[PDB]
Symmetry: D2
Subunit: 386 residues, 4 copies
């Protein structure tokens, strides 16, 4: 089964992504990976294309075994001692200001709970793993999943920001032809020009106020066959899977499929997507469901929305405790950006792509892309021939 | 590791819940299970206490091995032939009206996608597993998780409905002392009298309109130690875990932790929960986070909200296709209730309890409750003694 | 992915087998299950055909969801109080001789380690789960795996005893046409008449000596396609998988694939199975490998051998400690049979079938047998057309 | 839960080991890793200490998150084009002799089955992942497991060769004080001087004959507490786990716990290890069981033996098919060593250590070593105080 693992501290030597269980014969290259990593850097307002494929890909074609992708820490010389893997003379570390203890947990971050959980007196070991720099590894891994999805199913995963801060939410989703304008081209990775203006204005105002913003992104997966995921068990549902993968993203506090929480406010009479005959199979004219019924892809665009809390600690605003003393403190921020919502959309795409590729491989099996594609073709014929 | 599995068709012989990985020495009884199953039947507006513990519990005390709980199909004599496990003379089945083919998938249900996914020409095999009757098995399993949580951690999981249909959402959570009034006592399992009136009115109006309703429930887990879940990986986060478990519930289309989607609209300056010294450890005065930071329990009430779409197909309202012919059809409903949101709250409690018990057992280990409790005590001392 | 779980105490109410992840459309019936359970009762020298399919199978055809199979405790009225799931007045249990404490662990059994592991003062809770009665649930589950294997791949899994006690081991494997004579027909489930005589003589002599015996069984799976399992990871290897599944059997202390430990004594020049052209693909003339190279099925019969220690405690022979007092004791036996090796062969078949079905479903995917079969056909054509 | 993954092709850029689920606070260093990797190079008759810890360890202390260890391909400049991750002009590759197709599968290796499984026309992609170079990553990962085991439990894992080729097997196990003499000091990593001479003679003779050898190694884990693993399920048994982990090793065709296959030939009267009182708890005077009863550690040395087939293809001895043509061929070898059994012992130690560390973390839980150690102490007191 497709599995992905991420390793790396934000300031440690390197990040690693390992993707296990991908079929041989999928075309992906380190350029594709660096491309997605660049997309992750999008948003009002990287470091660099040396990422390195360590294993699993040969001549741009997956080998069938584990694919390990390293992403180098571009400022490793700064962190070489502070985040040294090996022991470092504790006397030559007591001189290092960079190694000063972090004992004031940031509200909203892993710091406090992580410190108590692991018995750390310093938040460094926690924030190092917990930081959203980890999502770069996620994205390196999702690239394999995207390539597979495109090549096996003609599936495209994209995202667009629906709101940032108190902006007025957008309604009506993009296809893949729009990803270019959405992707920066647009500062807030907005599909809609009016929501874009409203969100840009939200960012300017929070920047000016010295504040930080969250937002809602929607990922959209197009071209998916019916019957990915299953209704046979709670955890087999794609719903469940997508929500795990998406909510596990740093700062994500909410997920919905299609109209989500708003569906919960509708009447059954207008909550669902009715079906009608077409030349080609059943057609629908709404997609309130967001492409999922009974935990399965239902032939409509998959739409996953995530709510991102503000991730950047606002500079001198948040009372905390200095865990060393028990005394009041002010939370010191680690990040300086007002808003990471647009890049969160790209992380969401990544998570969705991973789950989707795993589900596709579950149903269609195969050890090589050609074999999976044959099985996909046979399944599509069986659904067409009915 | 704690794992739970559900088996059973809604009209098949029995449901089974198996809970694997629970410690020996947890007090739970078939009466406790039947109690939770009764709670699942709550809501404006069972069958019966014979459920049977098959394995894993002796003299009301878990044995340490797999706990299998059967829940008997109370109307099995009606379904004995239609849902017979063994072959039945196909001629003596062509006479059975009950076995008539189901070829008109209900919009919103597993039917259509499930039929194509599995190559079924009949929705019966799909709706049988897919139906929310399966959540009874969930709840039988969650009972073991609740007992463990109470006995190991003094943790209580409860729920309350925040909205049904277009009711005006409630704000401010219950403790366990309120579960009695919330639990029916209240028809809509509302904590708040004013939201209760508004939701009851929503149900009356939809009933009168021949329509169906969804709603938003919040589960609340109180008394949890800091450091359940982990920030070390996306899937290790309790966030992720809770969202999988909750969104995997039939009809759930949205999950949020604490203020969720509303957090995404706030400024960092007021999005998070600041920390202050207390006699007893750090204290907070908000819980916007819903008891989770960096994927970990943070010492505040856990608050998980789920959006439930309307699950009961509205009688003659929804166009579908008769998959046999390709012709238009009207979706025939399987369920008759206007609203299952309050019982969804109890299923949500169950899912949350399961995830929580699993996470607790991950951190605190142990093979017997006494051992887990010792490890919990040692951990609580280490957090107190700092 | 195919998963199986077993629940039940040897004297508790019922056993349950749950098989999750099997495709819809596999023909299996409760008669097939009872048949395999009968085969498990084979051997020099059941209770009864009421086993009950609880879920997952309709009209003898798997539904695609979890298949739960109950096996009723035939002497439940004896154990109704001693192995009651619910609390029983402790005063009306102090009268029950059957409930007397078991504090003298049997050497070779789970008792001692299990007692300390779980903090039990009584071995009852341990021996209840630990007992090989649990393998009946295994076998109920393996039946689904066998049916799938036969119907999807034309694969047959059988076993034969190679040695019991100090008998002289047999060499040269059966096909499925021999299972009838091997299966009892033969008292020691021997393929070879001379090994049979020698093993029967071993049993008579141990019976006469009041002793107990182990033995070596070989399971054989015929008709497997090339490429089940994978070399991509240690745990992906079929080797690894088979060894987990087989060694996890009660009393199994050794597994080998093909010539196993004897291979380790050969020279590379005669350790492996050379390949030659044939009309039909590569052919081999040895199968020292036992059908596995690089963790994959290699087109030769799969041959898995298991070493079973004596499982029946020899009546007054084994010193132990009375864990209550710390004083010497003699181990009291729970079982009375001299030898269970032939039935161990049938359990081995079951484990092998389960692993094989899981591996097949991994490679060939599918949600319904027809779909899996199509994918298998496409794969076999791709291997034929080269 | 402790998990380990290996990535890398034998001639690809690097290997990676990722260990997920290890507690914070375990002392391990890249020197410790390089040490174990050196031990893996032992045996009649590395490259180099630059391995690199990428993540998860800071100042020689595990961080609690995933630990990624890279092992660099020391001859990467030779393989930079042939095993390039990215596309390489196919015309500038048709000139590369090194890239010549490998179409003659080696009997005993993954080549043939892997080629058909994955639809490869070349064995390169198969032998690259399948090769035992992968066990270097295993060993890098096992080092974390060893450090944890030593620091948490005072457990030591060692190995010794019991036989190579037709040597006469040794009987009676080492403690950790002997690892130095066993480890090379001894050419065949023999504990016994007489078995050593006999195995050295076996190697000389096969070398002289231009042949290759397998052998039997025993790993021994000392100091383990009672109750690791569980009897509650087949896969929970340590037996099962150890057999998966050990048999999944390249070239391993057989595993046994303690006296294994020989136990199967004994009478119950002398098959097991009787228990007696001691000042200190129960004592035993045999260890036929190899430290496991009912799938649990039983307070005796853990003894796991593995049968290794000859892994080095014997130069011109083995008929194969040229899969391109269908014509006869001779298998061309990839490796030149006569025997890798002693290093297999070290890989076995590694696998055993991994399984053991995972099992310990299951029972004793904890997020930091101090916490796990507290839980271990509490458990040991509960077993002492009875």
């Amino acid at each position: 089964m497709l599995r992905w693992i991420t390793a790396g501290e934000s300031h440690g030597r390197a990040l690693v992504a390992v993707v296990e269980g991908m079929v041989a014969g999928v075309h992906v290259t380190s350029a594709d990976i660096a491309d997605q990593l660049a997309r992750r850097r999008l948003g009002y307002g990287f470091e660099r294309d040396a990422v390195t494929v360590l294993s699993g890909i040969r001549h741009g074609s997956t080998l069938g075994g584990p694919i390990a992708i390293e992403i180098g820490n571009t400022e490793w010389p700064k962190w070489e001692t502070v985040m040294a893997a090996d022991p470092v003379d504790p006397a030559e570390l007591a001189d290092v200001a960079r190694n000063a203890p972090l004992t004031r947990p940031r509200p909203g971050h892993a710091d406090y709970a992580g410190m108590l959980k692991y018995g750390f007196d310093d938040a460094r070991p926690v924030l190092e793993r917990a930081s959203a720099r980890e999502t770069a590894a996620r994205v390196a891994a999702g690239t394999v999943a995207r390539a597979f999805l495109r090549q096996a199913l003609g599936v495209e995963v994209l995202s667009h920001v629906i709101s940032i801060g108190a902006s007025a939410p957008y309604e009506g989703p993009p296809p893949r032809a729009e990803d270019l304008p959405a992707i920066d081209a647009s500062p807030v990775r907005a599909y809609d020009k009016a929501a874009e203006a409203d969100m840009i204005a939200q960012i300017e105002a929070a920047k000016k106020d010295g504040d930080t913003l969250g937002g809602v992104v929607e990922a959209v997966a197009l071209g998916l066959p019916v019957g990915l995921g299953s209704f046979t068990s709670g955890d087999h549902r794609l719903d469940s899977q997508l929500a795990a993968a998406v909510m596990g993203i740093q700062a994500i506090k909410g997920v919905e499929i299609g109209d989500g929480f708003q569906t919960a406010r509708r009447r059954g009479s207008r909550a669902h997507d009715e079906m009608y005959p077409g030349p080609d199979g059943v057609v629908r004219s709404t997609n309130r469901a967001g492409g999922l019924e009974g935990g399965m892809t239902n032939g409509q665009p998959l739409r996953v929305r995530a709510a991102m809390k503000p991730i950047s600690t606002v500079p001198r605003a948040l009372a905390t405790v200095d865990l060393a003393t028990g005394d009041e403190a002010v939370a010191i921020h680690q990040r300086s950006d007002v808003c990471a919502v647009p890049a969160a959309g790209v992380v969401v795409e990544t998570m969705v792509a991973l789950v989707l590729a795993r589900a596709a491989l579950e149903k269609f099996g195969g050890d090589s892309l050609a074999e999976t594609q044959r099985n996909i073709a046979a399944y599509q014929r069986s659904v067409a021939d009915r």
